[PDB]
Amino acid sequence: ADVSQYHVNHLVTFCLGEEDGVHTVEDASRKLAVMDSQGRVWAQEMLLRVSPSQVTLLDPVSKEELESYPLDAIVRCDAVMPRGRSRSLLLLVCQEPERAQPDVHFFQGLLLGAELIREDIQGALQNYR
Amino acid sequence: ADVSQYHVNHLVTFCLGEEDGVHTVEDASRKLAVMDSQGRVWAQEMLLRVSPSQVTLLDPVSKEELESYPLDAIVRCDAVMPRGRSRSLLLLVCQEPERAQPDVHFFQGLLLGAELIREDIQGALQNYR
Numbered sequence: 001a002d003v004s005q006y007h008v009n010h011l012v013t014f015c016l017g018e019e020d021g022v023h024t025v026e027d028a029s030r031k032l033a034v035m036d037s038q039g040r041v042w043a044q045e046m047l048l049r050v051s052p053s054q055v056t057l058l059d060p061v062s063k064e065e066l067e068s069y070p071l072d073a074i075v076r077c078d079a080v081m082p083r084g085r086s087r088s089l090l091l092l093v094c095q096e097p098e099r100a101q102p103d104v105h106f107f108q109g110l111l112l113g114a115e116l117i118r119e120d121i122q123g124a125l126q127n128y129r
Numbered sequence: 130a131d132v133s134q135y136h137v138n139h140l141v142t143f144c145l146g147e148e149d150g151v152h153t154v155e156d157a158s159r160k161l162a163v164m165d166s167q168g169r170v171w172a173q174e175m176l177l178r179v180s181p182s183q184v185t186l187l188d189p190v191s192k193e194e195l196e197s198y199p200l201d202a203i204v205r206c207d208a209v210m211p212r213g214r215s216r217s218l219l220l221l222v223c224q225e226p227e228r229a230q231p232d233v234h235f236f237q238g239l240l241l242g243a244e245l246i247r248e249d250i251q252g253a254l255q256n257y258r
């Protein structure tokens with residue numbers, strides 16, 4: 001029942017519209033690959049904080065919240081390894097209240113890794129449920 | 130060169146994908162109308178703050194930032210009156226850095242109105258430019 005924080009690299013955030021073609025995890029990974037080839041992916045260092053009530057994204061430097069997700073807004077969290085890469089990516093799917101559509105977020109887990117963060121967030125999701 | 134704050138009602142936030150069909154202001158208004166008919170629009174009271182460097186959305190109660198937009202992330206801001214309604218809506222189009230696509234936001238301007246807020250934000254955009 002704690003607060004933890006990890007340094008991750010945010011790769012991309014995109015919406016799941018009703019007409020995009022992103023239906024599976026593999027489609028989400030594919031889109032990241034295409035955006036990368038379009039020069040639309042720039043690894044941004046970020047602090048990812050997991051607490052009993054929310055997951056927060058913060059600026060490592062400023063230290064100010066950039067985004068905050070109550071746990072009930074989180075749809076799923078997975079450690080995913082897309083074909084082509086070798087280090088798992090952290091996949092987070094969320095639905096902010098204020099938003100019409102849910103979003104997909106990909107982060108590189110770095111040294112501690114995507115699986116550990118996924119487990120921490122999943123544990124937080126269960127205890128909240 | 131000041132900080133101002135308005136009480137508004139947030140109606141909807143949706144992304145401008147590359148495949149949705151929302152290309153004009155009228156298409157954006159139309160989509161709000163369709164989402165409303167789908168029971169997907171619930172007026173949420175919010176504080177909208179305009180400062181020399183950002184536009185911020187906050188909880189009237191908690192008073193905590195829900196969203197923050199540096200002025201350079203703001204694409205446009207208009208007072209729009211969709212056919213069917215009689216009070217102008219505040220339209221804000223933004224592109225967060227971390228996001229793959231820009232977003233459309235509609236708010237009701239309430240007593241002070243959408244035009245005054247639009248002017249305030251537009252004035253802030255110019256001075257920043």
Ligand SMILES: [Ca+2]
Nearest residue numbers: 002004050120
């Ligand atoms: Ca924990």
Ligand SMILES: [Ca+2]
Nearest residue numbers: 131133179249
């Ligand atoms: Ca002003």
